Each structure stands twice: as C-alpha cells, then as structure tokens.
Amino acid sequence: TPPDTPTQAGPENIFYDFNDGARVLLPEGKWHVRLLDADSENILFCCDVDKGWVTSSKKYFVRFRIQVFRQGEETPLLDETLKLKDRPVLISFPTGTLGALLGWFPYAERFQSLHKCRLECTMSQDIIDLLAPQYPQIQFSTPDKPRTVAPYATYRVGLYFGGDTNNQPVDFRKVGFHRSAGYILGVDPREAPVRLDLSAPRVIQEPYVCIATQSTCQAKYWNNGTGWSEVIAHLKSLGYRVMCIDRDAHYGQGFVWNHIPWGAEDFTGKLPLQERVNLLRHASFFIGLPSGLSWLAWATRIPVVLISGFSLPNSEFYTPWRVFNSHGCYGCWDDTSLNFDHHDFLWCPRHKNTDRQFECTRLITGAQVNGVINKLHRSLTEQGVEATL
Amino acid sequence: FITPPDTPTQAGPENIFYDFNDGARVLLPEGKWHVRLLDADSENILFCCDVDKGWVTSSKKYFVRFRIQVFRQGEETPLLDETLKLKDRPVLISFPTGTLGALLGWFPYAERFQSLHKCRLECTMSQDIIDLLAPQYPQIQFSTPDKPRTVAPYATYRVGLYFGGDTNNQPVDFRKVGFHRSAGYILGVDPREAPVRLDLSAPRVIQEPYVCIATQSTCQAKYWNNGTGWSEVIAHLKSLGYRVMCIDRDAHYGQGFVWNHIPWGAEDFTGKLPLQERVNLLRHASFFIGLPSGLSWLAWATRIPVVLISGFSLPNSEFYTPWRVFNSHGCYGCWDDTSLNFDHHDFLWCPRHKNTDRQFECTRLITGAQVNGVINKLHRSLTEQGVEAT
Amino acid sequence: FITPPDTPTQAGPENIFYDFNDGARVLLPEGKWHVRLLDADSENILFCCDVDKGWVTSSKKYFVRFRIQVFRQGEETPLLDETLKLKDRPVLISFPTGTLGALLGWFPYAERFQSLHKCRLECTMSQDIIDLLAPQYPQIQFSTPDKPRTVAPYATYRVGLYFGGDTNNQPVDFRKVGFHRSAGYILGVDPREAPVRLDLSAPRVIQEPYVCIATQSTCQAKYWNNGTGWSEVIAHLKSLGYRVMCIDRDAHYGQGFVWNHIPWGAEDFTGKLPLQERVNLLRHASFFIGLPSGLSWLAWATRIPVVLISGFSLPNSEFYTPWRVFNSHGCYGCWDDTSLNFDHHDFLWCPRHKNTDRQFECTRLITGAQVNGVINKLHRSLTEQ
Numbered sequence A: 001t002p003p004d005t006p007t008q009a010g011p012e013n014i015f016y017d018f019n020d021g022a023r024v025l026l027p028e029g030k031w032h033v034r035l036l037d038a039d040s041e042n043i044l045f046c047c048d049v050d051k052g053w054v055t056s057s058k059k060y061f062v063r064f065r066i067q068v069f070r071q072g073e074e075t076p077l078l079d080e081t082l083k084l085k086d087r088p089v090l091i092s093f094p095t096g097t098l099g100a101l102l103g104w105f106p107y108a109e110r111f112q113s114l115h116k117c118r119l120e121c122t123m124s125q126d127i128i129d130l131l132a133p134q135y136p137q138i139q140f141s142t143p144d145k146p147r148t149v150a151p152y153a154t155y156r157v158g159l160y161f162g163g164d165t166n167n168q169p170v171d172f173r174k175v176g177f178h179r180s181a182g183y184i185l186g187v188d189p190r191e192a193p194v195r196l197d198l199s200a201p202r203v204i205q206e207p208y209v210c211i212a213t214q215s216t217c218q219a220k221y222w223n224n225g226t227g228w229s230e231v232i233a234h235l236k237s238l239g240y241r242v243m244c245i246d247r248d249a250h251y252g253q254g255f256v257w258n259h260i261p262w263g264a265e266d267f268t269g270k271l272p273l274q275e276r277v278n279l280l281r282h283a284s285f286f287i288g289l290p291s292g293l294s295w296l297a298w299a300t301r302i303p304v305v306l307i308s309g310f311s312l313p314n315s316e317f318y319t320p321w322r323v324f325n326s327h328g329c330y331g332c333w334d335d336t337s338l339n340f341d342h343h344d345f346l347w348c349p350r351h352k353n354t355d356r357q358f359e360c361t362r363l364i365t366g367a368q369v370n371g372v373i374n375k376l377h378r379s380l381t382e383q384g385v386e387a388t389l
Numbered sequence B: 001f002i003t004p005p006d007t008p009t010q011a012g013p014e015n016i017f018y019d020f021n022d023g024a025r026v027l028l029p030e031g032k033w034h035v036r037l038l039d040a041d042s043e044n045i046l047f048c049c050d051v052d053k054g055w056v057t058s059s060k061k062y063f064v065r066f067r068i069q070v071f072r073q074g075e076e077t078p079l080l081d082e083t084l085k086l087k088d089r090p091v092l093i094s095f096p097t098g099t100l101g102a103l104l105g106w107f108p109y110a111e112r113f114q115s116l117h118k119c120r121l122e123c124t125m126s127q128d129i130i131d132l133l134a135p136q137y138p139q140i141q142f143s144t145p146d147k148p149r150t151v152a153p154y155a156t157y158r159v160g161l162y163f164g165g166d167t168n169n170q171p172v173d174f175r176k177v178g179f180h181r182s183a184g185y186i187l188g189v190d191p192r193e194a195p196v197r198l199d200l201s202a203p204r205v206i207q208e209p210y211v212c213i214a215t216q217s218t219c220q221a222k223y224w225n226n227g228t229g230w231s232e233v234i235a236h237l238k239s240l241g242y243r244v245m246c247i248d249r250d251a252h253y254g255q256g257f258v259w260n261h262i263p264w265g266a267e268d269f270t271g272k273l274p275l276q277e278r279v280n281l282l283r284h285a286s287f288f289i290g291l292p293s294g295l296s297w298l299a300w301a302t303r304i305p306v307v308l309i310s311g312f313s314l315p316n317s318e319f320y321t322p323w324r325v326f327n328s329h330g331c332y333g334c335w336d337d338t339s340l341n342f343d344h345h346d347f348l349w350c351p352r353h354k355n356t357d358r359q360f361e362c363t364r365l366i367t368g369a370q371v372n373g374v375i376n377k378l379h380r381s382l383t384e385q386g387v388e389a390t
Numbered sequence C: 001f002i003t004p005p006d007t008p009t010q011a012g013p014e015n016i017f018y019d020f021n022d023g024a025r026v027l028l029p030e031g032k033w034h035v036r037l038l039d040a041d042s043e044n045i046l047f048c049c050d051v052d053k054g055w056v057t058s059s060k061k062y063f064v065r066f067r068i069q070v071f072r073q074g075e076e077t078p079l080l081d082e083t084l085k086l087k088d089r090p091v092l093i094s095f096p097t098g099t100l101g102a103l104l105g106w107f108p109y110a111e112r113f114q115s116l117h118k119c120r121l122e123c124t125m126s127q128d129i130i131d132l133l134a135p136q137y138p139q140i141q142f143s144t145p146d147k148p149r150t151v152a153p154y155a156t157y158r159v160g161l162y163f164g165g166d167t168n169n170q171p172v173d174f175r176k177v178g179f180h181r182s183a184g185y186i187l188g189v190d191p192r193e194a195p196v197r198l199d200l201s202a203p204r205v206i207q208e209p210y211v212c213i214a215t216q217s218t219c220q221a222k223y224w225n226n227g228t229g230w231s232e233v234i235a236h237l238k239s240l241g242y243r244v245m246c247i248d249r250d251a252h253y254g255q256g257f258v259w260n261h262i263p264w265g266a267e268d269f270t271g272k273l274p275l276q277e278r279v280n281l282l283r284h285a286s287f288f289i290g291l292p293s294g295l296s297w298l299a300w301a302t303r304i305p306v307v308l309i310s311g312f313s314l315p316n317s318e319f320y321t322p323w324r325v326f327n328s329h330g331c332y333g334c335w336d337d338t339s340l341n342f343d344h345h346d347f348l349w350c351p352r353h354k355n356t357d358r359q360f361e362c363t364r365l366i367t368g369a370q371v372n373g374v375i376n377k378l379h380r381s382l383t384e385q
C-alpha cells in the first residue's frame, strides 16, 4: 500500500509523490496540472482540477515531470522531475513464488546500479534468506514490515494479465514473464541469474541427477504416461543416482494427483532453499519443469533440461537442453488471445475436457528427453563443465 | 464370442430340427404348424404362435427347462413333444472374452450346474484362465472360443454381464443381485458366492511377513483417487514390519493426461506373468489390499484376508469381507445404480459428477486413516488369533 | 415412535450441551461460535459453519463415530472436542411400533451392536415382541416406546425402512441391500443376516407329521394370486401324508371387494394368539410354506425348512432358503425397484400393471405345479437326509 499522503512537500501545501506512478495532492483552489515524460518531453496528461487527486495512468518506471499551474499563470508553481539518486526507493514483489522472484530480481539490482538510489525490496522471508547475503547494497524486508515508511518512489513488479498496459509497458506474454520486470523498471531487459552461496562442499560422492516433477498447475506437469519412468531408468543405466527435490511428494486437485515417481530418491519436503542450492550445485545436471526449481537450478550453474510444452522455448531462460514439441497444441499460456484461469487446474483453451487435453506435453515422449539427455551426457563426458556453461 | 450352430443339433421326426443353444430353438420345414414353448417346471405357456416356416426361438436365453411342442394345424396331439434333459448330454457354457475377476466369480456356478444335472460340460474362455483352473476341475472340459471341441452341443448358455437392464439373457438385472451371482441366476443354481479351487501347494519363497497390493484397474472410478492414500497405507504397513509388493499387470496405466503409476515405496512385482505365479506369491502373503479389480478375487481364492477398497460399488456387490472399506457420506455405488448406465468407452466415467469439483469424490472420501484403521484391526486379529480368524 | 430429549444429555464446559441422539447434536448458548463435525475414523470434516446460538445437527442420523468440535471464532484450539464413545454408556435403539418380520429380521443386528461397543443398550418395541425375545436376550433391556427407562440417553439410533431413496437416516437405500440387512448398515455392524434366538424348549403336541402355512398378507401383492395354487399345494401335501394348518392371524383379510380367506382343506389355527404359541407349534412342524410376511421370519427362527412364495420381491430381498419359489418370466420385484415407490395407503398396489389384465402377474405365474415341485424336492430331502 502507498502512503495516504504524498511523501514530498511542495510550495503552498501541495504534496507530490512517485509511489503509485506520479501522484500529486492539491489543497483548495483552481489548478492546471500537467504530467510530462522528461525524456521525450511529451505531455502525458493535462487537465484542469480544483482540488482532487491527480495520478498518471502509467505505473511503471517513467522519468515523470510534474507541473502544477495556477489557472492562467505563464510559469509553473511546481515543476519537479523524477530524480532517484540517494533517494528512498521501494520495489515491491508479491508474496513469494519462487522462480518468478529469481527471474525478476536481477533487474532490481540493475535498477539500483543505474540510478544509484537507496533501494528496499519487499518479498517473502525464505527468498530474503536466500539472496540477502550476496546483495549487501540492497535492503531486504517483508511486505508487512517495510523500513522506509516514506519512500520517494515505489515500483510494483509482477504479472499483470488481461493484456494490462498501465502497470507494465508491454504484455509479459510478448517479451517473457521474467524480462517484463526489466521493462517495468526500464533497464537492460536481458535475462540473468541471481547470485547464490555456492560455497557448500560436496556431500554425495557418486554422480547424481536432480529432478523436479511437481508444479502449481497441471498443464506444466509432464503428462506423458511413461515419461518420467523411462527417463529415470535411463539415467540409472548411465550410472546416475536420481533424486526428487520437490517440496511436496504428492500434489494435485480433485482426482488428478501427481506423486514422486517410483525409483527416484525421496529428497522432498519443505526445506530452506539454501539446502536445495547446496544439493543442486554438485549435481551432474537438473531435469525440471518450468516451475521455480528450474530457475534455482539455473542459478547454481548446472546444465538444465527443461521439459515444457505449455510454454514456448523463448519464454524462460535459454538452455540448449530445452525439450519441446511443435506438432500439436503448444504455448497455450503464451497466446495473447487466451487468458489464464487462476481457479482452474483444468483449463485448456483447445482441448480441455477432450481427448487431446494436455497434448502440449503428452507428445513429449521419454525417448525425446532421453535423446537430449544422451547429447548432454556425451557433452559432459567428452568435454567438461566448461563446454556447457 | 459364441456362435450357435446354423442348424439345430437334434433331429425331430418330420424333418423338424430342435435345439437348446441360444435358448430353445426349433427350425421347421415348409408347411402349416402351431408351435408352443412351455416351462416344464411351472407348466406355463411361455410362447404361443402360428408359423408356416422358419425359425422359432424363445425370447429367454438363460436356463429354463423348456418344453417344445410342435403341432400340425388342427391336431389334438403334438408331432414333437420334447422336454429339456441334460443328463449325459453335451452342454457348452461360454464365458465372455476373458477378464480376471469376473471369471473367478462366475466359474464356481458352472461346476454346480454340472454337478446338479450330471451333464458333459465344456467351458470356453481365454487360455491363461484355463491354465489356472483346468487341473483342479477335471470333470469339466476347458477350451478356447475359436477351438470348441463340441461341434454339435445339446444346450448352450452364455454367462456374461448384460447392461441396460436386459431381462432376456439374464433373469434379473445383475446390478440387483451382484454381477457375479448373476451367473448363478442364469444357470438356475445356488446363487451364493464361492471361491474357485486353485493350486495352493507352492512353497514359501519370501521368509519375512509381507503384504500384496493392487493399485491398477480398467476404469478410473475403481482406483483409489485419494491423494495421499496409498502412500500413507504403505508407510503404515512398513511401520508394522511388513514388506509391500505391487502385483498389478501394468506399472503404468491410464488415458489422456490421467495416468496411474505404481506407488513409491512398493516393491516392483508388476508385469505380465502367468496367474499361477501370482497365486504362489499371494498365498504366503499376510494379507492383500486391493481394488474391486480381479486380483482381489484371485486373492480371495488364495484364502488370505482381503482388504477391498472401493466406493464406486456397494459392499454387497462383491464377495463378502469384514475388511471391506467403504464411505457413505458422498457419491457412491454408481455401478449398482439401475437408473445409470456404464460406459465401456469412457475411462473417466462418473455419471453424476464428471467434470466437476466432486468427480470421483466417493473414492476420495476414503482417507488413508480409514484404511489404516481397518488394517490395524486386521493386524491385531492376525497377531492375537492367527489365521483361524474369519 | 419416539422423541429425542429437547435438551442434549451431555454437559460441556461453557454451558454448551452436546448429544448423540438423532445424529450428533449440539446446542450453543449466546455468543459467536465456529462448530465442526468430523468422522473420527476417516478424519473427514463432515460439517463446518459459523453459528450464533441455536441447534447444530449432522444431516446423517445413522451410526457414525462423530467428533464434535466447538471453536471460538478466532481460536486455534477447540473449546469442546468430544468424540463418540459408547462403552458403558446409555444407548437407545428405537424400532417402530413395529411389524413382525421386520423386527425379527432387524433385532440380531442390535445384539451385535451391543457386543461390539460393550454399551448399556435399551430397545423400544411393541409388547408382544418383547415377550417373545426378552428372556433369551438378558444383556439387553426391553421397553415400550411410551415407557422408556433411560430418560437421558447418550446416543439414540432409529432403525426402520426409509422410502424415497433416503440416505440421511440410512447409509444405503434398503432396496439395494435388503430391508433387514439395512439395520446392520445403520448400526455399522456385520450386515450378514441372522435368526433371532427363541424358546425352542416346548414339547411336541401333535404326533402326526404336519405342515404350517401362512396365506394372508398386508398388501395384495405379497399374496399368492394364482387361482388354484394353495388348493393344489394343500391337496398335494395331504397326499404325501401331511396335516395342513393355517397359522395366520386373520382368517379373512382384504379391502374393498378383494378379500382373501383361509383356504378350504386347511385346518383353522388362526386368531390373535401370543407369538410363543406360534413358535411352539411351528417348531415341530415338518416344514413351513409362507409368504414374505413375518410368519416366514418366525418360521425361519424356529429352525425349520421354509418354502417362501413371492414374486413381488427378489430372491435376495429376504433370508436365504433353497426352497425359494420365484418366477422370472413376467413382472417381478415391484418392491426392490429403486425407480418405483411403495404406497402404504394402497392395498391393491402394483405400480406397473394396476387395473390391467396383468395385475399381480408377479405371483400369478407361480403355479401350483412349481411349488409342488419344490415341495417334492424338500420332501425327498427330509425322508432321505
């Protein structure tokens, strides 16, 4: 929540602010308020108002220029341009869902390095415990306990559906959900991994592989019947130990329930993320869904085989071991003509409650994934961990 | 699966051919005749008709002691008056192309039918079931559907499930008496259930106490669709000092995106093995936890305690077992409901709550704590009063 | 019938009163409560709501090991958390001012319920049935509906037939499992049928071999509506050297113009006698030929062969007997069909064929020759083994 009263004091009891876009609160009189884009000198908004609130429709980063006129005056009573250097800036991520935070957060550091501001970021505690030690320049906090109280500017990074163009410059479906943060903060949009504590010594001596079979919605699962079984068996035949590191061993809704695959070691449970990083680091590689554990595995600098058909290859971070099939329905989430249902586990634009439901992922056979795994294995044996990454 | 002789097997005087395959049949040459079919036991006139030529068959196909009367138009007495008499005659009982549970349920009635009428009985079924049963039932001749040895049988009876409330090929709807007892009703014998006789001579292989489980079936309604059920049960079994083994034919089975896998923690004894090996493994098991699939019937026949988990069928639809798990607070017993109809082509069949939040709800309401409570009772019963407890 | 206490019998802490008569009841005083009802066996949350002062009852009335939880509307832990526990507690089982075969069929499940939970059980029924059963069941206290001796019972269960596919007072529709097994389902015990224990000590009075029959029924459907059935059967019985004796309560019974009388040739042992005398006569009988009426259940409990003639109910609707007579070529099982509904006010009830040519075809197809065939098998079985 933004402050009820704007944080900056202007002359003649006018209060201005940049917390939820560019805001300005006028007392009593007859005013003519003008919002400009300082970079392009375009007049973004302009109106005659007597008292009420005036906010910009755009909420993402824009170097706003606020002008407050008297209704007939030549020069401005107030004329303040956004300037963030050595100022209290608050970046608010939503209550934590991994992966999304790992994807977004590297854009928050770029925002701080660019504008040289005093930055505080609000997120769930576990992500703070994961990230905070490596980013000393940024102050971490939880949503319910923010330490700036009165911030100069606030920006709210998140996913905004329905083709929203007011809190984000472009629909995130067009540029990728994680880059979108870069666009919102107006920095270098190119993806990057977060910096983690990779100092933890190896525990398990034998070569082993980490896998993640669970996600938040069923579309993201690998809904091939014999997929995970064939993959795990093939991994074992190559001399790998296989370990599931999902948070839940069993997850699903109604009658559709997904369980940790037979043959995979049980490393599941609600553990602190640092332990997962430690285990993942010394793994030979990681085979995952588009869920967050794939982003965590990416940040630990190990090869990531990412199995997804419900999302396009360019929607997540790049990896040469991306598994994807293009002969059936695919990229259902990606399309801008469809809208994601938050209350439906089930929900297919084009085959829901039909014979072809979750075809996006069913066409991805074990043999395909095992073909990718064979390439990645030969790359690891012949060349080293240098060649992949 | 079964095709009656195109020409009736029994010869009647004036080139009339009569038969008791596919109900009571009679084929007349050309002429004028009045034909009557009677129930010899009740002396009721079942069918009255006038026909010049062609086929005359009874609408009822299940066992009835028929009495066929063929009359020349205007005659007082019958030309042919033959009543069904099965002693020392070729009788062919035809099961549907094989399934595991339905055959094990049905077949004991076939033996009663032979012991009652003292007839030469041949039964047609799939080969694996023949390999399982044949040695213990010497008096009955086993064959496959494509290679029947009795080319000209006196009477034929076709035991099976008949949906849509059929009352011509079965006396009662099988949903009213239980699918397996229906066979008894069709053959007109003692309908009370019984287990088949198996080869229980196999020596114990695994020394430690162990439990057999079956998680797979043909349609999703029969599965235990609780999220954490099988996991909690297997963990509880292990905590009691049991080894747990899955003996399903398939390790993975399902349709579309719905797929069921052998539960983590259970030993892999899956695969397409001969049934006799499954009998050998099941016999020395401490007890069995199963669905309403056939492996529960096979486990029942091996004289071990059977915990049967099902909500899509009523408790009285299968064989009796004190360890039957059932929940009556939600949807249940769709299978037994005579107002509904089973879909053979729909794997995700639940007629009343498909594609809703409450789909397969009745199965779900069966929690791991309920089944573990039954397992606790059965465990204490076994430790305290051994295997002599009924 | 029977009324539950207007105020729950068990005291809870903050003037909360809970109870297990008529399902799980709880009565809250004034305040702001959040009440949950759970199934202790499955740990499922059966019911859950926020209520200010009033009654909260479970929709299910049959036996469930309920668990009642009463919350403050913001509390973490329960103010009251009580699970059903019946050992050494006052439990009341109420049968209707019941019919004869229904009570004989049901009552064995009441004894199982007591032996399982080790409770102090009182059963309410009509006096004649009490006189019949009470001496053999000392562990259970018998009473009449109007004079119950447990004024404040811990749990109450009401065994009966509930039509219209009711699933709140009985777990399953009784047409699906059989009317008498339903009791077992209601009390959550072994549903398998059993005969009550009677006084079978009475000495033989009639020397010659004899047969007991019960012609009359309540509903015309249950009668043997074949024209010459009973006459042929009685004549055949006499030709086999049996004396034939009718033990129905009424010699004449029926409605409107449809009237049924004690068949000619059968001896008149009718009348409103105490059931114990009927038991005494039935015991030494060679066998019994009856309808689905109660006297067939009484004859069953006296451990004599029972030929049961019925078409309006399926063979599995009553107790098992190898001498069951049934015809499957016409209308049958008017009674077991879940798509139909029994009319208590209609004596001439057949839903599918009333006022047609085929009315009570259910039983008319059952000829005397059929029943005499069964009797011939049973007679040879008696003379030989």
Ligand SMILES: Nc1ncnc2c1ncn2[C@@H]1O[C@H](COP(=O)(O)OP(=O)(O)O[C@H]2O[C@@H]([C@H](O)CO)[C@H](O)[C@@H](O)[C@H]2O)[C@@H](O)[C@H]1O
Residues within 6 Å of the ligand: A097, A098, A099, A100, A101, A177, A212, A214, A215, A216, A217, A220, A245, A246, A247, A248, A269, A270, A271, A272, A273, A276, A290, A291, A292, A293, A311, A315, A316, A333
């Ligand atoms: N404490 C933990 N300890 C150990 N493991 C844990 C822990 N917590 C979660 N997991 C595990 O990761 C998954 C959650 O993924 P998350 O919420 O972060 O994903 P979310 O669905 O919101 O979006 C996903 O879906 C992707 C999709 O492509 C968007 O269109 C997004 O790009 C990205 O945000 C990704 O996430 C869980 O299912 C667990 O298995």
Ligand SMILES: Nc1ncnc2c1ncn2[C@@H]1O[C@H](COP(=O)(O)OP(=O)(O)O[C@H]2O[C@@H]([C@H](O)CO)[C@H](O)[C@@H](O)[C@H]2O)[C@@H](O)[C@H]1O
Residues within 6 Å of the ligand: B099, B100, B101, B102, B103, B105, B179, B214, B215, B216, B217, B218, B219, B247, B248, B249, B250, B271, B272, B273, B274, B275, B278, B292, B293, B294, B295, B313, B317, B318
């Ligand atoms: N060689 C084998 N070695 C080891 N296991 C084997 C072998 N072969 C099959 N199975 C396994 O048996 C089950 C399927 O058979 P099944 O006939 O039982 O089941 P189906 O789905 O057709 O429904 C059932 O439904 C039951 C009915 O619903 C009772 O309520 C029927 O009584 C039963 O006969 C059958 O109708 C699966 O679990 C197979 O992997």
Ligand SMILES: Nc1ncnc2c1ncn2[C@@H]1O[C@H](COP(=O)(O)OP(=O)(O)O[C@H]2O[C@@H]([C@H](O)CO)[C@H](O)[C@@H](O)[C@H]2O)[C@@H](O)[C@H]1O
Residues within 6 Å of the ligand: C099, C100, C101, C102, C103, C105, C179, C214, C216, C217, C218, C219, C247, C248, C249, C250, C271, C272, C273, C274, C275, C278, C291, C292, C293, C294, C295, C297, C313, C317, C318, C335
């Ligand atoms: N004082 C007496 N002294 C001696 N005998 C007596 C005396 N009084 C009555 N009978 C005699 O028992 C019968 C009473 O009817 P009843 O309860 O039996 O039948 P009701 O129609 O209510 O339904 C019945 O329906 C039967 C049916 O088979 C269920 O589908 C049930 O099995 C049966 O338990 C009951 O449901 C009378 O018809 C008499 O002959």
Ligand SMILES: [Fe+3]
Residues within 6 Å of the ligand: A219, A310, A329, A330, A331, A332, A348, A349, A358, A359, A360
């Ligand atoms: Fe899709």
Ligand SMILES: [Fe+3]
Residues within 6 Å of the ligand: B221, B312, B331, B332, B334, B350, B351, B352, B353, B360, B361, B362
């Ligand atoms: Fe259902």
Ligand SMILES: [Fe+3]
Residues within 6 Å of the ligand: C312, C331, C332, C334, C350, C351, C352, C353, C360, C361, C362
């Ligand atoms: Fe009828």
